[PDB]
Homo-oligomer: A and B are copies of this chain.
Amino acid sequence: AEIDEGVFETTATIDNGSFGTRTIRFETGRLALQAAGAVVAYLDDDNMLLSATTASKNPKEHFDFFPLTVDVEERMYAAGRIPGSFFRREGRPSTDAILTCRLIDRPLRPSFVDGLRNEIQIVVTILSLDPGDLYDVLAINAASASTQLGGLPFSGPIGGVRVALIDGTWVGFPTVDQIERAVFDMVVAGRIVEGDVAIMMVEAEATENVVELVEGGAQAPTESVVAAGLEAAKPFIAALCTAQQELADAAGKSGKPTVDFPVFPDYGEDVYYSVSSVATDELAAALTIGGKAERDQRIDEIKTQVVQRLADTYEGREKEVGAALRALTKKLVRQRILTDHFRIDGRGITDIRALSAEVAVVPRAHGSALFERGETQILGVTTLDMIKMAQQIDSLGPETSKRYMHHYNFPPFSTGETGRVGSPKRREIGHGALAERALVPVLPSVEEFPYAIRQVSEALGSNGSTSMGSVCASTLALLNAGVPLKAPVAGIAMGLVSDDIQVEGAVDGVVERRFVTLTDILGAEDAFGDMDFKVAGTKDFVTALQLDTKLDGIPSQVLAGALEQAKDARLTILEVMAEAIDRPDEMSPYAPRVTTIKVPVDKIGEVIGPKGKVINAITEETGAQISIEDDGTVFVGATDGPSAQAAIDKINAIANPQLPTVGERFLGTVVKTTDFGAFVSLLPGRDGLVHISKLGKGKRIAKVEDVVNVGDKLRVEIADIDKRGKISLI
């Protein structure tokens, strides 16, 4: 066992009520000795991931941001399988790997000492994944433990758990079974400070059967239930963080940092003091008028005047004074928004910016959308095709066949600046994943609507948040394409500014926490904002959330009000949508007309046979571009409507030995006809059953050469064909 010193193990016990108990263990020191921090993780004792963070000794100069680059080596051998690629090796990390990478990276950057320059990378390699489990929460927990153990400057460990509303109860670290049983899952990452846990980050979800459960008996996910879920997630985070700190202080490390890290602040305190003291009041006075027409030009001219005024004094320093002006205008806009609460546009705080939506723009495509909310412009397009082609990833997760894949784009010409175009970055994948995760539950079932949907959310220009516009374009396109949505979906971005300055407060202690939740966020608004939710859902139940608290948010009182404002914005957006388009439109004939049919499973051997030919010939000659389906039950389709109907008739005629019903005719492949009998060579192995006396009128033949006379008028017609499957007359 642990006979040697250096392998420090701990436990993280979670009850999860009466739905089973799972244990989480962190063991350090046995592996990856050289890396600064080598914690591993255990769930149920059948899950194993190893985390490691390594600090570059040589500091970086040309960098100006924090170069924290996280990555997950999602090795294929954790489950008992071999990669299916042409090279038999894991390639570039898949979509789920990049999603988990963004999941781990997001609640780590704010919790770092400002202005760190030495390159820091966190590696989380997967080693064993039981089926039905997700490698998200314990991965981020392990990474937090790893960066904690290494002695890096870190503001305490962060825990991460998944909760799920299953039958009115929340469970931690659920498996796929309860995830299907539950109606609403979210990940929650947080840190405890001063004895209270603060929700650093939460990424929500709606399952693939939430509508059925809500109709079948459940509670509609709303602000109350998500608040309850946060409350239920708090104790699990507390337990995880306590376990992490027990591990950290057990090793005797994470106390005094033996290795110091040179910090690179953007601006000095002296230049800050000088700039603020020389330009504290005139800039505020010029801002307070808010001309809304030339106020911007006035503020630029103040920046120019101040920078020429204090650029002669100090030579060779340019960026720091710009950052100092940024911080100045920062403090002024926050005090202004906490005292009189004006937005950059100058209008109210509880009203959405002007918007407009158009439908049926792209001519040939099966759908279109021009959701044009203010400056943000998003174009969405559907492309319906046969269930033959769809997302078919292979990875450690249990997901195998994605019917609905939601691509995305951030072309450089949209933002207003140049840049290379090619493989999308991680932000693109994250936003597209959020859009798909938000729009999945309302999409219809497979059986009612057997089709493959692909949605591309082109971004034709964007100022701030742009994923919600992508969701709106996606729903517009889905209704225009003919997909029978259960309920149109919509999204909106929700900001919030904290209270850093009180009312005067020289002798009076009062905290006017005027938690202004701005109805929408601009790029500058997100720059000087402190909070963001970006919720999205239908009229009744939310679908996605993304909260990225910097620190010590914990409103616990106005979160309901912010959710209510988001809900009001969502209903306004949906009302404008309904004024634009309301009901699922008729399906446009340019799409392939695939009509489902029902056949017995054992009868497929007669329908398709041993993967036979002639199917491609009929595809070329008529347009029956159907191929071998994985499910077996074949749904043939054709692009043109009349062609689709003709295909239905001819395949229904050729594939089956159809009963001689009323008006039934036989149209097969007649290659040979002879007079010494008859043969139906439909498919090898089996032959069409015939009756000897119903064809020969109860008379036999002796010879073919002499007996068969030239002149035999064959007035032979079948009278009755029964379904017994044998030959017997009276």
Contact = CB atoms under 8 A, between A and B. Distances in A.
A454 interface: yes
Contacts of A683: 610
Contacts of A612: 605, 609-612, 684
A100 to B, nearest CB: 15
A413 B610 contact: no
B620 A614 contact: no
B412 A123 contact: yes
Contacts of A590: 80
A390 interface: yes
A405 interface: yes
A496 interface: no
Copies of chain A in the complex: 3
A675 B727 CA distance: 11
Interface stretch (A104-112, A440-448, A687-695): A687-695
Contact of A365 (B77, B407, B413, B610): B77
A156 interface: no
Contacts of A73: 411, 421
Contacts of A92: 422
B416 A54 contact: yes
A727 B616 CA distance: 30
Nearest to A683: B610
Contacts of A676: 676-677, 689, 691, 730
A693 B672 contact: no
A561 interface: no
A391 to B, nearest CB: 5
Contact of A84 (B125, B389, B461, B616): B389
Contacts of A610: 605, 609-614, 683-684
A364 B79 contact: yes
A127 interface: yes
Interface residues of A, number: 121
Contacts of A703: 691-693
A69 to B, nearest CB: 8
A383 interface: yes
Interface string A402-431: 000101000111111111011000000000
Contacts of A364: 46, 48, 78-80, 127-130
A81 B611 contact: no
A592 B80 contact: yes
A617 interface: yes
A692 B701 CA distance: 9
A602 B669 CA distance: 10
Contacts of A366: 80
Nearest to A128: B364
A89 interface: yes
B704 A454 contact: no
Interface in A714-729: 726-727
Contact of A54 (B417, B620, B692): B417
A582 to B, nearest CB: 22
Nearest to A678: B676
B461 A35 contact: yes
B684 A693 contact: no
Nearest to A607: B685
Contact of A604 (B456, B458, B613): B613
A31 interface: yes
B614 A605 contact: yes
A617 B693 CA distance: 38
B617 A601 contact: yes
Contacts of A286: none
A470 interface: no
A698 interface: yes
A86 to B, nearest CB: 8
A396 to B, nearest CB: 10
Contact of A629 (B35, B407, B616): B616
Contact of A407 (B71, B89, B379, B601): B89
Given A34-B461, A412-B121, A672-B686, A82 B617 contact: no
A575 to B, nearest CB: 22
A381 interface: yes
Contacts of A385: 80-82
A631 B614 CA distance: 10
A46 to B, nearest CB: 5
Contact of A88 (B52, B390, B415): B390
B730 A77 contact: no
B421 A123 contact: yes
Contact of A127 (B57, B365, B681): B365
Interface in A588-634: 590-592, 601-602, 604-605, 609-614, 616-617, 620, 628-632
Given A605-B610, A613-B609, A54 B119 contact: no
A702 interface: yes
Contacts of A88: 389-391, 405, 454
A34 B609 contact: no
Contacts of A304: none
A431 to B, nearest CB: 15
A297 interface: no
A414 B605 contact: no
A693 B704 contact: yes
Contacts of A675: 677, 689, 691-692
A363 interface: yes
Interface in A635-651: 639
B452 A82 contact: yes
A47 to B, nearest CB: 8
A613 B591 contact: no
Given A381-B77, A613-B632, A413 B54 contact: yes
Interface in A356-386: 362-366, 375, 377, 379, 381, 383-385
Contact of A128 (B31, B89, B362): B362
Given A79-B364, A461-B32, A610-B611, A704 B685 contact: no
13 contacts: A32-B414, A33-B375, A34-B375, A35-B461, A56-B417, A77-B454, A609-B685, A611-B611, A613-B632, A676-B676, A677-B689, A691-B704, A705-B730
Given A80-B365, A84-B389, A675-B677, 10 more contacts: A33-B375, A48-B362, A77-B365, A78-B365, A80-B591, A123-B411, A125-B411, A609-B685, A612-B684, A691-B703
A-B residue pairs, 7 tightest by C-beta: A610-B612, A128-B364, A617-B630, A52-B413, A35-B413, A34-B461, A34-B416
